[PDB]
Amino acid sequence: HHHHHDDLTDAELAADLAADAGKLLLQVRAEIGFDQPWTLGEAGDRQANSLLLRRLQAERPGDAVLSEEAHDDLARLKSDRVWIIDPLDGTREFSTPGRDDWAVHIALWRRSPEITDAAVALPARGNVVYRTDTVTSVPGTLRIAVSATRPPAVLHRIRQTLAIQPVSIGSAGAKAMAVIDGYVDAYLHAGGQWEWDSAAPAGVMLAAGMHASRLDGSPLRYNQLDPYLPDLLMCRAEVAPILLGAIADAWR
Numbered sequence: 001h002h003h004h005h006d007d008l009t010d011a012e013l014a015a016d017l018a019a020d021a022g023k024l025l026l027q028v029r030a031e032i033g034f035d036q037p038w039t040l041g042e043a044g045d046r047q048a049n050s051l052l053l054r055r056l057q058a059e060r061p062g063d064a065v066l067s068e069e070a071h072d073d074l075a076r077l078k079s080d081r082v083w084i085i086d087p088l089d090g091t092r093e094f095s096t097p098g099r100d101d102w103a104v105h106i107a108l109w110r111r112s113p114e115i116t117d118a119a120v121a122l123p124a125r126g127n128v129v130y131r132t133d134t135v136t137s138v139p140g141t142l143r144i145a146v147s148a149t150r151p152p153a154v155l156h157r158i159r160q161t162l163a164i165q166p167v168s169i170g171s172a173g174a175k176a177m178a179v180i181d182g183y184v185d186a187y188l189h190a191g192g193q194w195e196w197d198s199a200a201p202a203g204v205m206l207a208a209g210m211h212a213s214r215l216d217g218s219p220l221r222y223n224q225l226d227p228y229l230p231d232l233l234m235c236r237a238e239v240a241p242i243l244l245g246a247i248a249d250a251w252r
């Protein structure tokens, strides 16, 4: 009794869901294997989604769910609590032998509005789970994580004035966690993305006392009618002014 103020907290549930989906994805990878990457990716997406939706209905039956892998009935627009999930982020990388740059994203949005609780699993990295309740708090040259598939064109403009080495990595979750780890200084994206790509990484980023915003510096906004959310900057706080400034100056 009195577990907090099964019965998990929202953050504990986010972490457990991310880990559980992580393990299932690892099982799918081992069972289906890499002969047909399309088949492997589809199975991972579908099975992880099924697990997550089943558990969210069982354990949070009153909460809305927005998932990449399910139809969106928009009931969430009237809810005060919405899980925003990417059952497998970096499906491409998951489907490729030896790649560890893929993730599970589990975010809870609560009306106010904020991502209040979140977890990001990197299942191939020992199924590590970064979570909002346990994550902790000028360089002459910047390492910036960018998509290994569709890197943002805006990076080329800012590189005229800032010394930057782009670090190509798959998955939004993997790139955001690379910022937390200190493997890169920043993660920059533009050109398109969805709420579930950034919601859990943003929640973790902000809980770590780091910076997460749109490229124009405005807050990342979630549970919108159109869950397209095309650009982001996630980085150490001190680096934010430098990069947001360069982005802004690119429009001069």
Ligand SMILES: Nc1ncnc2c1ncn2[C@@H]1O[C@H](COP(=O)(O)O)[C@@H](O)[C@H]1O
Binding pocket: 089, 090, 146, 147, 148, 149, 150, 169, 170, 171, 172, 190, 191, 192, 193, 194, 197
């Ligand atoms: N230009 C884009 N438009 C829509 N979604 C994207 C775009 N670039 C990346 N994403 C998505 O963002 C996530 C991370 O992609 P990446 O960083 O390319 O591995 C994946 O779910 C991608 O499908």
Ligand SMILES: [Mg+2]
Binding pocket: 068, 091
């Ligand atoms: Mg996708």
Ligand SMILES: [Mg+2]
Binding pocket: 045, 068, 086, 087, 088, 089, 090, 091
């Ligand atoms: Mg996905």
Ligand SMILES: [Mg+2]
Binding pocket: 068, 086, 088, 089, 090, 196, 197
């Ligand atoms: Mg994704």
